Coordinates of C-alpha atoms in Angstrom, one line a residue:
Chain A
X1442 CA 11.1 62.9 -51.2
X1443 CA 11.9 65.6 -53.4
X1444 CA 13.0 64.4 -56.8
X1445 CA 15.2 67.6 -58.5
X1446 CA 17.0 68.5 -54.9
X1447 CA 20.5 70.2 -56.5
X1448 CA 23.5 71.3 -54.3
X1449 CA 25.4 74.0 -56.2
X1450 CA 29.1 75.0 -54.3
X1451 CA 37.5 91.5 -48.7
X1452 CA 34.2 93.6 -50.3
X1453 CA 34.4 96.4 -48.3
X1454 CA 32.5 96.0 -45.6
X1455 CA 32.1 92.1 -44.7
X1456 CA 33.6 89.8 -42.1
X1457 CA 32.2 86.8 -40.7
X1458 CA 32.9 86.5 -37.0
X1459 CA 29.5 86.6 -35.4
X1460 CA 30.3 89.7 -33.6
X1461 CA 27.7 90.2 -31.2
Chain B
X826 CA 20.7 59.3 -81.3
X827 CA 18.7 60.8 -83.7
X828 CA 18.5 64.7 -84.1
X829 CA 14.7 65.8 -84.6
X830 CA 14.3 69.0 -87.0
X831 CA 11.7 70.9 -84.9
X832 CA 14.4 70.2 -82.0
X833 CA 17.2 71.6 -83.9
X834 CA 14.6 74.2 -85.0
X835 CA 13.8 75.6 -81.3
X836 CA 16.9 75.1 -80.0
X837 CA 18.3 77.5 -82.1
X838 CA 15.9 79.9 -82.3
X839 CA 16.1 80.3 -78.5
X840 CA 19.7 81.1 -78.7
X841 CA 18.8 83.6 -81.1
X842 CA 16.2 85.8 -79.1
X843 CA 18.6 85.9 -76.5
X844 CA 22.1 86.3 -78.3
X845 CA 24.2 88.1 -75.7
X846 CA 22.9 85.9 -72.4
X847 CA 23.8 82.1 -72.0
X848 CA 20.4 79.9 -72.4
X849 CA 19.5 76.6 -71.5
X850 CA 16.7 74.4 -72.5
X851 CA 15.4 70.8 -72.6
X852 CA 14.9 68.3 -75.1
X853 CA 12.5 65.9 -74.5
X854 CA 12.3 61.8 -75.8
X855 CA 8.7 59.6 -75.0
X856 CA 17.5 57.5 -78.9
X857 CA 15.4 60.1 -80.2
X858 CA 15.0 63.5 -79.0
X859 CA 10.9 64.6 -80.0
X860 CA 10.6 68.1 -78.7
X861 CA 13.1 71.5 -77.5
X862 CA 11.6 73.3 -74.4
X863 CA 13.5 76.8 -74.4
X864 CA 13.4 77.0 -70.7
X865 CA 15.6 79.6 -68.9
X866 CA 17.7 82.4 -70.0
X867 CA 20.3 84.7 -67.9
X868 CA 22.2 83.3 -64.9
X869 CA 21.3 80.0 -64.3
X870 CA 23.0 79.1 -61.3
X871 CA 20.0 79.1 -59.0
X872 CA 17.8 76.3 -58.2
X873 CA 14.2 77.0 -57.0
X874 CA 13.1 78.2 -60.4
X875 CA 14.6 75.4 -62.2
X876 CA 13.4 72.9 -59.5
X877 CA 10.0 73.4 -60.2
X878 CA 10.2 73.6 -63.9
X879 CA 11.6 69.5 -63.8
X880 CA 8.5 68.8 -61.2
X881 CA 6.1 70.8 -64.1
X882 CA 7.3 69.1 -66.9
X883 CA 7.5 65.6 -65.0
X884 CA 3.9 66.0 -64.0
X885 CA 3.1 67.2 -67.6
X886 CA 4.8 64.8 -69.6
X887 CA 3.6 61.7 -68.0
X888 CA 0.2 62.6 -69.8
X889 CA 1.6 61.5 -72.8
X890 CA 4.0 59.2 -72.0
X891 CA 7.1 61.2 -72.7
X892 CA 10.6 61.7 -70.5
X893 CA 12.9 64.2 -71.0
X894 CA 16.1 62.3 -71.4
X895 CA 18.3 65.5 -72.6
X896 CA 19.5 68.4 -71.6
X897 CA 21.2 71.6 -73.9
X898 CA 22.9 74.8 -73.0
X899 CA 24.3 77.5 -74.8
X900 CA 26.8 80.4 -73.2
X901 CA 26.6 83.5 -73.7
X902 CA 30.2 83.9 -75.2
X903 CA 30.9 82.4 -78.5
X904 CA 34.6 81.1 -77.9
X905 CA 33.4 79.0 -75.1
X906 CA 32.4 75.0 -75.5
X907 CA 33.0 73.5 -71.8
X908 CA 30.3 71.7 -69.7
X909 CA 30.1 74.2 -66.7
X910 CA 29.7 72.6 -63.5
X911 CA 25.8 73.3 -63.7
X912 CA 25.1 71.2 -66.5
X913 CA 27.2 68.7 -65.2
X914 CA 25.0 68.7 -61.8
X915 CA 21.6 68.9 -63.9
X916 CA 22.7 65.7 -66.2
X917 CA 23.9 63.4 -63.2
X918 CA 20.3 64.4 -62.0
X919 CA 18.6 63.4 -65.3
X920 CA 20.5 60.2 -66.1
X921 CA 19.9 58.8 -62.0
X922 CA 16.6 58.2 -63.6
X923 CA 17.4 57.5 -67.2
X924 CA 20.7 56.3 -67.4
X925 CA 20.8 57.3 -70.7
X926 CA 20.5 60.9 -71.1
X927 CA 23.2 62.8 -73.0
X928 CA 24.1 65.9 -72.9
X929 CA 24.4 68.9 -75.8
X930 CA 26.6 72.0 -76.1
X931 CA 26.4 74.2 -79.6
X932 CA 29.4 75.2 -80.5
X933 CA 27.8 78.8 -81.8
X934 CA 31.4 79.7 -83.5
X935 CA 29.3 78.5 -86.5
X936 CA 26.0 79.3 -86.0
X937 CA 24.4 79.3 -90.1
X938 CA 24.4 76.4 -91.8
X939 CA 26.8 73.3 -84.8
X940 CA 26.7 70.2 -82.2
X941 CA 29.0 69.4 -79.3
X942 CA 27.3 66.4 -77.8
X943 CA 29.1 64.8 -75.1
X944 CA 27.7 61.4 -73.4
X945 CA 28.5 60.1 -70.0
X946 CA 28.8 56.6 -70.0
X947 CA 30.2 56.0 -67.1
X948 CA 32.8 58.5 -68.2
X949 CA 32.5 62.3 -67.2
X950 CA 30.3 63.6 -70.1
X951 CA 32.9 62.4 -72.7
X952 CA 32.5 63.7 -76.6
X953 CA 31.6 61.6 -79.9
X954 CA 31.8 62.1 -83.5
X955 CA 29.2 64.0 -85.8
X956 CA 25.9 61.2 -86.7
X957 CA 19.7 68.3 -94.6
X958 CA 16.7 69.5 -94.8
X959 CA 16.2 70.5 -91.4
X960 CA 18.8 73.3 -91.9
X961 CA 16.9 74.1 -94.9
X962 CA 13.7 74.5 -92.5
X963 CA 16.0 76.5 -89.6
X964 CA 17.4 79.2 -92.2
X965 CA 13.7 79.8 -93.5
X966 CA 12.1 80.2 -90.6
X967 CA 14.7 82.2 -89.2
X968 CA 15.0 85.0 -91.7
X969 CA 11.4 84.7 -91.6
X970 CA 11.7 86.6 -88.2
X971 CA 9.2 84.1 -86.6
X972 CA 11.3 84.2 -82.9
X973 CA 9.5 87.1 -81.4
X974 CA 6.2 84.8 -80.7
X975 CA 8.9 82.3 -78.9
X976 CA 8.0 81.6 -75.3
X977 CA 10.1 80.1 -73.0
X978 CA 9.3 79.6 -69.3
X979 CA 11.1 82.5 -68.1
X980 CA 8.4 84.5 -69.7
X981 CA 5.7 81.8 -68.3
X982 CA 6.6 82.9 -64.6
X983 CA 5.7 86.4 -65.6
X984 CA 2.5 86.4 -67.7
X985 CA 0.8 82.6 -67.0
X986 CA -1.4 83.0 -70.0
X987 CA 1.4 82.1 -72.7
X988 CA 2.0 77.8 -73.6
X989 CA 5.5 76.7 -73.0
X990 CA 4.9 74.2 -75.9
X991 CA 4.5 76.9 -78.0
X992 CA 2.5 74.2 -80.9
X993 CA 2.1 77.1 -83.2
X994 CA 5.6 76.4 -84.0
X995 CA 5.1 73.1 -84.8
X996 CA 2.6 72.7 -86.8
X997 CA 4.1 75.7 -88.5
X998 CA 7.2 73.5 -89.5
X999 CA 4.6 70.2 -90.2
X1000 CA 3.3 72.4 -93.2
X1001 CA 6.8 73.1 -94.5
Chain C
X457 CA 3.1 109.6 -86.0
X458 CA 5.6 110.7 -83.1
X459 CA 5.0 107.7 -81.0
X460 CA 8.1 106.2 -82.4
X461 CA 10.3 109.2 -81.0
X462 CA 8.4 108.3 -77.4
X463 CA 9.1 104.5 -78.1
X464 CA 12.7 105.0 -78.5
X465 CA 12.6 107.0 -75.4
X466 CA 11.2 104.2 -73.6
X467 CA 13.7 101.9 -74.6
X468 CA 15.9 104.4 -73.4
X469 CA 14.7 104.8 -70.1
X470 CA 14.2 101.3 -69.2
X471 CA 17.2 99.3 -70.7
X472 CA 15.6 97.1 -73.2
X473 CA 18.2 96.1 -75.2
X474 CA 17.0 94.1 -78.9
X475 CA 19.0 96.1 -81.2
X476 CA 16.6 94.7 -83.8
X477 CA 14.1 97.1 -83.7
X478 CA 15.9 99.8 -82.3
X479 CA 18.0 100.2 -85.5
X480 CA 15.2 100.3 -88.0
X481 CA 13.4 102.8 -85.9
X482 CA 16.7 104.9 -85.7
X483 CA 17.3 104.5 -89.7
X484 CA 13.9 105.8 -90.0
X485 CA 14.4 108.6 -87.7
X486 CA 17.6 109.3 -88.9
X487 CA 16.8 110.8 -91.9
X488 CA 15.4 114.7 -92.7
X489 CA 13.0 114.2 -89.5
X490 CA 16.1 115.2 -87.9
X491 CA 16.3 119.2 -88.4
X492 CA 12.0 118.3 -87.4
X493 CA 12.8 117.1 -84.0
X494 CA 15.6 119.9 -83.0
X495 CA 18.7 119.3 -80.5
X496 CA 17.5 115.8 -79.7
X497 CA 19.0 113.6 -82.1
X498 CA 22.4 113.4 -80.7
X499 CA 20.8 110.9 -77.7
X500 CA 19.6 108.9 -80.4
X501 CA 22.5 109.0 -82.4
X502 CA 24.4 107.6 -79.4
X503 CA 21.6 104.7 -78.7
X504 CA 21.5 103.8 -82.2
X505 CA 25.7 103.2 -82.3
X506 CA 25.4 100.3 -79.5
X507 CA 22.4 98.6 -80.6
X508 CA 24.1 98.6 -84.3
X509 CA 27.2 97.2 -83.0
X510 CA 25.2 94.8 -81.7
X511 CA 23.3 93.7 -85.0
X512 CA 26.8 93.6 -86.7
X513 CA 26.6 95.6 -89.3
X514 CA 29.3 98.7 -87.8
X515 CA 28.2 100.4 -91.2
X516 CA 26.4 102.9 -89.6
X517 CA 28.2 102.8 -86.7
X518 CA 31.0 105.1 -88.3
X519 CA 28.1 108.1 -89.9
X520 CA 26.3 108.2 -86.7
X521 CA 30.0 108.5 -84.6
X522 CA 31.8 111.3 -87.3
X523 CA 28.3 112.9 -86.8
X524 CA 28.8 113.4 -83.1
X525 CA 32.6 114.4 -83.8
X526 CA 31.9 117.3 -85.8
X527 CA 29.5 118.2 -83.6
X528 CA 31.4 117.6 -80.1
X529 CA 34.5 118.2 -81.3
X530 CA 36.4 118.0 -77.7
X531 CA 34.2 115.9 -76.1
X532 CA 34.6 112.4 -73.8
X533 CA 31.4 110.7 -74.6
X534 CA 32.5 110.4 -78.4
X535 CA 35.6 109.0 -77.5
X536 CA 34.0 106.1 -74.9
X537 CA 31.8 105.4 -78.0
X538 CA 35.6 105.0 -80.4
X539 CA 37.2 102.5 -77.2
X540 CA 33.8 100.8 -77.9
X541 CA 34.0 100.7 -81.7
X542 CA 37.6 99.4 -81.0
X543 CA 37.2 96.7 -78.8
X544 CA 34.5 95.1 -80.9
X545 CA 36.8 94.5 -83.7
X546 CA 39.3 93.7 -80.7
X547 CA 42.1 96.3 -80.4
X548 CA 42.4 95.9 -76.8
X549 CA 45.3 97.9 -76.3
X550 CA 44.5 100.7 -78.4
X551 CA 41.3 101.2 -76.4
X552 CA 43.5 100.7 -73.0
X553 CA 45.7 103.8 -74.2
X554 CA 42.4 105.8 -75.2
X555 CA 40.7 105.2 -71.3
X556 CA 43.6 106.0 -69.8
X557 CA 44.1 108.9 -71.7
X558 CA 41.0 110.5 -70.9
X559 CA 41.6 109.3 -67.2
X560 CA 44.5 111.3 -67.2
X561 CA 43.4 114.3 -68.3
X562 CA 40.3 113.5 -66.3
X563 CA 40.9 111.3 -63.0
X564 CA 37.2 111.6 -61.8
X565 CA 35.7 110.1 -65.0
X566 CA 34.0 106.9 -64.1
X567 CA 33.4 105.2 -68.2
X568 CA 36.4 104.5 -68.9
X569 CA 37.3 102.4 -65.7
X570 CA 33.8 100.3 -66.9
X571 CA 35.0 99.9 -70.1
X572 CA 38.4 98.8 -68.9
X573 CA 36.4 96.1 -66.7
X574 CA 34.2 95.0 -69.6
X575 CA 37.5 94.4 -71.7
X576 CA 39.4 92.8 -69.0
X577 CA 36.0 89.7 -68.7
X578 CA 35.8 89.8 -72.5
X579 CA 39.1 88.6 -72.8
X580 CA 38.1 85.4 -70.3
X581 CA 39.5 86.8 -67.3
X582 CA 37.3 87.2 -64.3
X583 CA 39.3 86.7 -60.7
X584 CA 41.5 90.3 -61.7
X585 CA 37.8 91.9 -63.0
X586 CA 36.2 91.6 -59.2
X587 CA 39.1 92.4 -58.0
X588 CA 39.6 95.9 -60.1
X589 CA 35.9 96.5 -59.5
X590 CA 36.2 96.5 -56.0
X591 CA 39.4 98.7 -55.9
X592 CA 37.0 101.0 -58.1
X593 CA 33.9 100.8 -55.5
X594 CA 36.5 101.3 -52.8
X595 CA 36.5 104.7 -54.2
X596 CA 32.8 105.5 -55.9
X597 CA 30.2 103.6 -53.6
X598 CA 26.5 104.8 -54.7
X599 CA 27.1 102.6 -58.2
X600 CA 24.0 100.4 -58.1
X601 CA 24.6 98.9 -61.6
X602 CA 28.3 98.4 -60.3
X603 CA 27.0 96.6 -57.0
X604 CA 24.2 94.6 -59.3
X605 CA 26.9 93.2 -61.8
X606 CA 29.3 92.3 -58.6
X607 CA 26.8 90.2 -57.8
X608 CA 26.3 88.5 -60.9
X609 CA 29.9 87.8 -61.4
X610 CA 30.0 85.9 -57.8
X611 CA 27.8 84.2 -59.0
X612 CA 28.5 82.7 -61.5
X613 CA 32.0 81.9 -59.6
X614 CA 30.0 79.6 -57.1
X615 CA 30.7 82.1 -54.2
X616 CA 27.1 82.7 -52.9
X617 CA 27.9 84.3 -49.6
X618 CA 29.3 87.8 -50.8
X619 CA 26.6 88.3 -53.7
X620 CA 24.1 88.3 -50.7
X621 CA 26.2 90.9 -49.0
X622 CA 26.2 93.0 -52.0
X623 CA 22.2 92.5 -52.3
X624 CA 22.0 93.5 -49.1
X625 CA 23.9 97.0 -49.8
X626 CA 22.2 97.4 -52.5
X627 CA 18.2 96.5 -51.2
X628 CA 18.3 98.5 -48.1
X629 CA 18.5 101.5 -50.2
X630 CA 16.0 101.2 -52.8
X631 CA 13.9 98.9 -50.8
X632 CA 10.8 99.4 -52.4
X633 CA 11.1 97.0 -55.5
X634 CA 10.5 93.4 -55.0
X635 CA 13.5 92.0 -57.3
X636 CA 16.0 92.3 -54.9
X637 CA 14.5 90.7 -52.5
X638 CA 13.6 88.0 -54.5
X639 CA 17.2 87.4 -55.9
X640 CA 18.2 87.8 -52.1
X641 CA 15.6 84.5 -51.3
X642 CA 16.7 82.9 -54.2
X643 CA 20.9 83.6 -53.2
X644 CA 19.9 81.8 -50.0
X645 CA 17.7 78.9 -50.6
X646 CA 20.7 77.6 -53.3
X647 CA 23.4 78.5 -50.1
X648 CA 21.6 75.5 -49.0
X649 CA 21.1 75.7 -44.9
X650 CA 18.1 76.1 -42.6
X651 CA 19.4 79.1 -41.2
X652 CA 19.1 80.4 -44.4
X653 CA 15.7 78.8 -45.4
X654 CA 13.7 80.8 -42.9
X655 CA 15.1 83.6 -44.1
X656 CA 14.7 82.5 -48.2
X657 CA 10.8 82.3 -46.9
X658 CA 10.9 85.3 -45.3
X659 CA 11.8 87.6 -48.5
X660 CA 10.1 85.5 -50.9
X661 CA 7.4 86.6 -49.0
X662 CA 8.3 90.4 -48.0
X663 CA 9.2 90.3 -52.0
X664 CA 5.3 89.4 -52.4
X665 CA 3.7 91.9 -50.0
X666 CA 5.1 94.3 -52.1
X667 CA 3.8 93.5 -55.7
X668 CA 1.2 90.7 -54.7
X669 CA 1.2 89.3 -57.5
X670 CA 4.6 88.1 -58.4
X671 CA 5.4 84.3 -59.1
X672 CA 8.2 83.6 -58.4
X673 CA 8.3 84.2 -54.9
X674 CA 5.2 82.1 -54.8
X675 CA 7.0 79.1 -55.5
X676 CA 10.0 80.2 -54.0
X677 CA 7.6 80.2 -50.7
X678 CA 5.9 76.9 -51.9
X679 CA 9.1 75.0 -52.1
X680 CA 10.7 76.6 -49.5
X681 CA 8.1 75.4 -46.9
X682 CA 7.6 72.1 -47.9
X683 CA 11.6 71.9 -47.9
X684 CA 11.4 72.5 -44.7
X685 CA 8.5 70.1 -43.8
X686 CA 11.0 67.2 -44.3
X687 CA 14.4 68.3 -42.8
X688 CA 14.2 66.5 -39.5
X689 CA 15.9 69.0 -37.1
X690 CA 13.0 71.6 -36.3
X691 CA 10.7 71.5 -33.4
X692 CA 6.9 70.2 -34.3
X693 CA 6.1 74.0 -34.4
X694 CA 8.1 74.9 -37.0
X695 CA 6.4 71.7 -39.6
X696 CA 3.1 72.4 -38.6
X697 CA 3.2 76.2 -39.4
X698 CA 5.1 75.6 -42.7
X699 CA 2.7 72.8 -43.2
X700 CA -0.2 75.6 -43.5
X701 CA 1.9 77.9 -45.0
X702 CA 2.3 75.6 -48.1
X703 CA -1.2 74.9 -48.0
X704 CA -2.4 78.7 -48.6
X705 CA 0.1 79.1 -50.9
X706 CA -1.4 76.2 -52.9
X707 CA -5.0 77.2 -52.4
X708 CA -3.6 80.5 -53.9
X709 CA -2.1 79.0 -56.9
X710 CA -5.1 77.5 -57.7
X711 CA -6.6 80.4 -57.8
X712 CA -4.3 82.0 -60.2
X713 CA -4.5 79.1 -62.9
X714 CA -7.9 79.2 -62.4
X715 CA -7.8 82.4 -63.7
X716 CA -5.3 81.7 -66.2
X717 CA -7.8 78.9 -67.6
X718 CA -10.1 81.2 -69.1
X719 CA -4.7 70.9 -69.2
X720 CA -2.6 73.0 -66.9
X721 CA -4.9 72.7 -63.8
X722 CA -4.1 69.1 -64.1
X723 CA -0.4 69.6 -63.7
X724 CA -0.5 71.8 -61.3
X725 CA -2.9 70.3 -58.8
X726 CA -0.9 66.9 -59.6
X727 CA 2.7 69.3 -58.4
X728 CA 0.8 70.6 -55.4
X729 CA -0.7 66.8 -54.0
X730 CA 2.2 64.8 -54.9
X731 CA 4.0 66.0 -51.3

């Protein structure tokens, strides 16, 4: 049990596809 | 909803030794608000560090019986008064175990000679109406250049041997 | 007696900006000490203008800038330090004009496109600042500071996932310091995710290797374990070793405020048995 848990939420070079 | 002077006192002074980055810091009760903690200055929106500092000052502040009830931040920008997400998070947090906490924003468009506080009450973080000597005490001890001995926790993390409650302060304001 | 030359150097050298002691120094050293020091007070003249605008008292802001005028008469440095001057009693415009002036008789000048960013999120206005930034790095990659402020301004937009691509270009060069790596850990264990923890453990610990005897990353490791001692979706292996790791890292910590005590023990040993 952890008291204080939080939850906070085109650059050249970055997709996301999980290319292999 | 009292406002303490030595709160006021650090509270400011912490915005002041860091005038071009947003701070936050802590205020805390055993409504009346007994003692500013100057926590955290720079980004902000990153939890480990600020996780552990609640746990610390939990596990402190049981010792003598206080709870921290209160929360403050200050931006960095001086036309700015709106409760960023963050302190929105950090208050839900505070108030699932008090109920009661409120929430403070300085409006720093002022700053000499301030207060934004909002309170939730079942509404989200709505505002209220303005509720002396104590500014008498902040102008002194400010132009007596006295912020350079301040020490948040920020500076804790890097050399351990400093005292986040900083009592030199206060009893420097109890013999004013 | 010179110490305060070398001081301002320092200060200098690794940005350490107070402008509160910087301008009294530079007041002091302004004065017939100059035609002493020889051919060196122009740096100073230029680090004492910012710091003053940053005090507020743009008094000496003007002696220190006509100073470097008659000196440099056609120079570009001097009139950076005018956009400056102008944008802090807010002509915005004006100072647009004077960047894109000394753009256009110089395209390759790199100032004036990082002063027209810093008045572009001074105004408010962020989404069109990353975007102008990156149409800038799209051009002059090798910008650290560029790459470093990037970064900062995702996040504080709430997008998490790009900062750490930036970190990433910007600690595999340079990947001898352990700040990046702990701002990487740190990026990731807020992303939330335990593909992400393992990794937020990893570099808060690579990030301690380095320097050994950082923090931080001591917590970061700390929570990040015993984080991960609770999520219910890892194989026994994975809670046992995390189990241990947390353990050392405690044993450690003791260590250090045992050190330090030379009331806090008590807090700390009450953080480290409560889980």
């Amino acid at each position: 049990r952890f008291k204080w848990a939080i939850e906070l939420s085109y650059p050249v070079g970055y997709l996301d596809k999980q290319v292999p | 909803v009292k406002l303490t002077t030595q709160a006021y006192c650090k509270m400011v002074l912490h915005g002041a030794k860091y005038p071009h980055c947003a701070v936050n810091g802590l205020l805390v009760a055993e409504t009346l608000f007994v003692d500013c903690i100057p926590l955290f200055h720079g980004t902000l929106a990153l939890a480990p560090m600020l996780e552990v500092a609640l746990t610390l000052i939990d596990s402190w502040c049981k010792d003598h019986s206080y709870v921290i009830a209160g929360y403050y931040q200050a931006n960095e920008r001086v036309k700015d008064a709106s409760p960023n997400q963050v302190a929105e998070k950090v208050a839900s947090r505070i108030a699932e175990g008090f109920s009661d906490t409120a929430l403070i924003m300085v409006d720093n468009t002022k700053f000499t000679m301030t207060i934004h506080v909002y309170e939730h009450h079942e509404n989200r973080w709505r505002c209220r109406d303005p509720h002396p000597e104590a500014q008498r005490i902040s102008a002194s001890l400010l132009d007596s250049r006295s912020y350079e001995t301040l020490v948040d926790f920020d500076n804790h993390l890097d050399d351990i041997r400093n005292d986040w409650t900083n009592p030199e302060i206060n009893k420097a304001v109890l013999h004013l | 007696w010179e110490e305060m030359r070398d001081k301002m150097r320092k200060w200098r050298e690794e940005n350490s900006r107070n402008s509160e002691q910087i301008v009294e120094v530079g007041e002091e050293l302004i004065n017939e000490y100059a035609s002493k020091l020889g051919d060196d007070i122009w740096i100073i003249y230029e680090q004492v203008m910012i710091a003053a605008l940053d005090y507020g008292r743009d008094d000496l802001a003007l002696f220190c800038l006509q100073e470097l005028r008659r000196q440099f008469p056609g120079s570009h440095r001097v009139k950076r330090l005018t956009g400056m001057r102008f944008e802090a009693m807010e002509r915005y415009d004006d100072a647009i004009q004077l960047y894109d002036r000394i753009l256009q008789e110089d395209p390759t000048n790199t100032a004036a496109r990082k002063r027209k960013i810093a008045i572009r999120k001074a105004q408010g206005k962020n989404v069109e600042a990353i975007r102008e930034l990156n149409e800038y790095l799209e051009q002059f990659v090798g910008d650290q500071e560029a790459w470093h402020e990037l970064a900062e301004l995702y996040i504080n937009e709430h997008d998490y996932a790009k900062a750490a691509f930036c970190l990433e270009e910007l600690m595999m060069t340079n990947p001898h310091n352990h700040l990046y790596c702990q701002q990487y850990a740190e990026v990731k264990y807020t992303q939330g995710g335990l593909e992400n923890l393992e990794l937020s453990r990893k570099y808060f610990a690579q990030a301690l290797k380095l320097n050994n005897r950082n923090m931080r990353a001591l917590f970061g490791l700390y929570m990040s374990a015993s984080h991960i001692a609770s999520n219910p979706k890892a194989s026994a292996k994975t809670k046992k070793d995390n189990m241990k790791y947390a353990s050392w890292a405690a044993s450690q910590i003791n260590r250090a405020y045992q050190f330090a005590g030379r009331y806090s023990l008590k807090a700390v040993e009450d953080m480290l048995e409560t889980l």
